[PDB]
Design a protein around this nucleic acid. Structure first.
Ligand SMILES: [Mg+2]
Ligand SMILES: [Mg+2]
Ligand SMILES: [Mg+2]
Ligand SMILES: [Mg+2]
Ligand SMILES: [Mg+2]
Ligand SMILES: [Mg+2]
Ligand SMILES: [Zn+2]
Lengths: 132, 322, 217
RNA sequence: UAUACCGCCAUCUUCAGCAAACCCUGAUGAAGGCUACAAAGUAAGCGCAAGUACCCACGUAAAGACGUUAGGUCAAGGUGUAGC
């Protein structure tokens, strides 16, 4: 029984989010594109490095924000940067949020020489979409 | 390496294996001994840049480990669980009262009391032996308001609350005379469970099944002798007891039907007779047909108790308290 | 704040002129005393049935008239307190007439297929705060199949003063105010429907008159 | 150590049911609940269904649900006990 991204039903009480409540084949029907880069063209280079950077930054932002993420991230690319659209969960105080954001921005700028400025979207309750 | 890094919930699920979080690691205070204007100092009011020695950071880590150990110890805190009838079992155990209704009906006055628990294993087409559970709960505070119910399911708390709701929707009433003893004796034969009850006064003691003891405590009866004859089937015994309690001849109704008063010569008091019930209109002036040597099919146990002929290694021995 | 509603109507027998709504001769004209055969007759229906005419049961119209008076007085007193009445029927012989009568009356009805327990589980099936039927009047206790209707069971489980014209098959002991008599002829059904309609209308008129009398203060 | 898992995939799957919350029945037993000229069944939730892409909505693509096979993998990462 294949079980890629589709979640197996068990009881109608699974508080699943919006993005998490979508099969892995609806990328061209219902589900959109999270990360984007020219590496997945026919055909342009710069693909392996972009995918590695995306997979690394995802875990980085998820670790720096322990539990303060309502759902998965939505990476982007505009210039020599990598915008990250996230649905932050109202957990810590705004002062701590600003401090951590500034610290992470400065650290990334001085580490990768690329100002990876992110974006937040504070939401208290998780965006439950279905009860699988 | 970095490629060997992933989430933590997945690793936890894998380590647990049941098929077939950063509390101690603070996020605000830097894990390296350092001071900053942000936190650990007056919240922006001496805002400077300092650094703590590595020994101080090691001490902070040891304090966090001690806090983790204290939390683990708190997790080991024991609790009190009243033993129902049998040790470590849900025999005569009690729980919270039933929940109210939608519009109201404050049923919190009644008290719940789980009786028996049974794990039924029934095979299926593919799921196999279904671990189904059947429970029989009896709810009721007293004053006649009570009633049994049933609630079978593959769960515990769900089945308990289902049985509680069923009992709330199935409230039985029993006509009583002075909350202490039943009207008269009953000699029923429910299917295969015999019930031989005997009218006894107050302060006599509860000489009946523990389930029957709990049923009486919930109903209101204080003490009453009962010979649990025949097989010991919880469900059938309770059903027969309920049927007998529902089929009883009261005093007022009997007097209104027959007419004659209730004559009695209590031994505790004097010969002064005190009527217990009187008719609601007429009065049969003629007396009952005092036909001696009647045909009252008494039980052999009655004769054995009256003549003291009963003897065994467990006749009438001292029982527990409460 | 009007406690007189609990004393004025319940004082004099036949407050709304119940016995005058019908007549012994008018009831006999419908041949309601007729019944089914002794074999089809029910055991508990023996006391209410008088004799038989060549295996054709006959019901004493006196007991039927008394039960009808009692049921009509009960329904009138209920309407005086504003209550819902539910008509039941499944023989499909006079469903249109019963529907027209329910339309004429100021109450509801349901003479169609009764799903599995619509009144018991009314909390989930119907709305949560639904004014359950406070009275039931059976127009055809026997449905298409020789089986007692479940309405009596739901009533006994919900404690509702049941009314109806029991036949020689059902169990009148389960019904509160049974009414022995025929339940197949057309004239009898028409007379019963007209009597129920007149009773309801007169009860509503008397309720309005008593309300006006109270308002006179 | 995969006959301890997360994760991944394979047949049944040439399928149509699978269920929370309720009600009824079996003198209230494990259990069953189907008869539209209608006898107790109501069913949010998942799936078939449905919906969506190139050349349309067709043909080609995605899914084939609960579960048997302790199905195979330390052999992509960590992983209950042992050890160099
Ligand atoms: Mg013990
Ligand atoms: Mg394996
Ligand atoms: Mg296939
Ligand atoms: Mg497909
Ligand atoms: Mg699909
Ligand atoms: Mg293997
Ligand atoms: Zn009949």
């Amino acid at each position: 029984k294949n079980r890629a991204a589709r979640v197996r039903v068990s009881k109608g009480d699974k508080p699943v989010t919006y993005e998490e409540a979508h099969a892995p084949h609806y990328i061209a029907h219902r589900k959109g594109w999270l990360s984007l880069h020219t590496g997945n063209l026919d055909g342009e280079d710069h693909a392996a490095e972009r995918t590695v950077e995306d997979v690394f930054l995802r875990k980085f932002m998820w670790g720096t924000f322990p539990g303060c993420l309502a759902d998965q991230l939505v990476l982007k690319r505009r210039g020599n940067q990598l915008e990250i659209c996230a649905v932050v969960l109202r957990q810590l105080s705004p002062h701590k949020y600003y401090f951590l954001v500034g610290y992470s921005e400065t650290l990334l700028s001085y580490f990768y020489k690329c100002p990876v400025r992110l974006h937040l979207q504070t939401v208290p309750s998780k965006v439950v979409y279905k009860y699988l | 390496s970095f490629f060997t890094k992933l989430t933590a919930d997945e690793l936890w699920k894998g380590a647990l294996a049941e098929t077939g979080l950063n509390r101690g690691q603070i996020i605000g205070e830097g894990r390296y001994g350092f001071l900053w204007p942000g936190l650990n100092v007056p919240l922006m009011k001496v805002q400077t840049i300092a650094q703590r020695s590595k020994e101080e950071q090691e001490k902070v880590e040891a304090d966090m480990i001690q806090q983790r150990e204290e939390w683990d110890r708190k997790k080991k805190m024991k609790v009190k669980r009243e033993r129902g009838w049998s040790g470590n079992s849900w025999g005569g155990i009690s729980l919270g009262p039933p929940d109210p209704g939608p519009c109201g009906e404050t049923y919190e006055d009644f008290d719940t009391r789980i009786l028996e628990v049974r794990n039924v294993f029934t095979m299926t087409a593919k799921e196999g032996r279904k671990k189904s559970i059947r429970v029989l709960v009896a709810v009721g505070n007293g004053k006649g308001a009570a009633g049994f119910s049933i609630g079978k399911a593959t769960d515990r708390m769900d089945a308990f609350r289902k049985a509680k709701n069923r009992a709330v929707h199935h409230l039985h009433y029993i006509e009583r005379y002075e909350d202490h003893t039943i009207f008269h004796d009953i000699s029923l034969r429910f299917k295969r469970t015999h019930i031989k009850m005997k009218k006894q006064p107050k302060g006599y003691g509860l000489r009946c099944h523990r389930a029957i003891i709990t049923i009486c405590r919930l109903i209101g009866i204080k003490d009453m002798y009962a010979k649990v004859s025949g097989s010991i089937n919880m469900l059938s015994l309770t059903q027969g007891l309920f049927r007998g309690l529902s089929r009883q001849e009261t005093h007022q109704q009997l007097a209104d039907k027959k007419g004659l008063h209730v004559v009695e010569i209590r031994e505790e008091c004097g010969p002064l007779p005190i009527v217990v019930a009187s008719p609601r209109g007429p009065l049969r002036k003629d007396p009952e047909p005092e036909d001696e040597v009647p045909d009252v099919k008494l039980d052999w146990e009655d004769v054995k108790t009256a003549q003291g002929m009963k003897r065994s290694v467990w006749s009438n021995l001292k029982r527990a308290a409460t | 704040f009007n406690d007189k509603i609990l004393n004025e109507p319940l004082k004099h027998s036949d407050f709304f002129n119940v016995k005058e709504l019908f007549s012994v001769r008018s009831l006999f004209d419908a041949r309601v005393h007729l019944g089914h055969k002794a074999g089809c007759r029910h055991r508990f229906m023996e006391p209410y049935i008088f004799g038989s005419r060549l295996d054709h049961d006959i019901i004493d119209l006196e007991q039927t008239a008394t039960h009808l008076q009692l049921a009509l007085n009960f329904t009138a007193h209920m309407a005086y307190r504003k209550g819902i009445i539910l008509f039941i029927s499944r023989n499909r012989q006079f469903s249109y007439l019963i529907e027209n009568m329910a339309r004429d009356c100021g109450e509801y009805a349901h003479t169609r297929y009764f799903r599995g327990g619509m009144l018991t589980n009314a909390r989930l099936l119907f709305g949560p705060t639904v004014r359950l039927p406070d009275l039931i009047i059976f127009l055809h206790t026997l449905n298409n199949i020789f089986e007692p209707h479940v309405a009596v069971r739901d009533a006994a489980k919900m404690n509702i003063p049941t009314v109806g014209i029991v036949d020689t098959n059902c169990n009148p002991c389960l019904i509160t105010y049974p009414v022995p008599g025929n339940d197949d002829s057309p004239l009898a059904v028409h007379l019963y429907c007209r009597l129920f309609q007149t009773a309801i209308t007169r009860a509503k008129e008397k309720r309005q008159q008593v309300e006006a009398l109270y308002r006179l203060q």
